[PDB]
Amino acid sequence: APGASIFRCRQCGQTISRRDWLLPMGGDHEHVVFNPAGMIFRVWCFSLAQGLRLIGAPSGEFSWFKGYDWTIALCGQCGSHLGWHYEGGSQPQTFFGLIKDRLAEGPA
Numbered sequence: 001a002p003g004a005s006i007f008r009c010r011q012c013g014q015t016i017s018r019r020d021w022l023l024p025m026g027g028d029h030e031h032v033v034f035n036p037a038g039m040i041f042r043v044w045c046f047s048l049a050q051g052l053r054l055i056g057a058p059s060g061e062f063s064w065f066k067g068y069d070w071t072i073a074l075c076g077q078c079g080s081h082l083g084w085h086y087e088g089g090s091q092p093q094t095f096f097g098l099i100k101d102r103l104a105e106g107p108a
Ligand SMILES: O=C1CC[C@]2(CC(c3ccccc3[N+](=O)[O-])=NO2)C(=O)N1
Pocket: 034, 035, 036, 061, 062, 063, 064, 065, 070, 084
């Protein structure tokens, strides 16, 4: 009866990811970054996610991860901005960077 195994959208409950899918990119699953507007994000990297809607085509502009292009990842249910999908890189080619405090963790 694990209580901390699934991540859901904090706004609506959409199933998004799993603790088992956390990915230590450069040795840590947690990365703290700012966008050009100075907004701080505490980002968890996941090998896999579901329930998102990836918006538009990838961009390398101001990418926080060397060699990856990003696409905005909304909650596919409620449209909450949950993070980014990264692609175009190497080992791995793709991953998800999700904003920790926009998810809720709970039982399967
Ligand atoms: O890895 C990333 C993804 C999020 C982003 C990219 C970004 C941005 C940069 C240029 C144009 C538009 C956007 N946007 O997210 O809408 N703002 O924050 C950033 O700085 N780095």
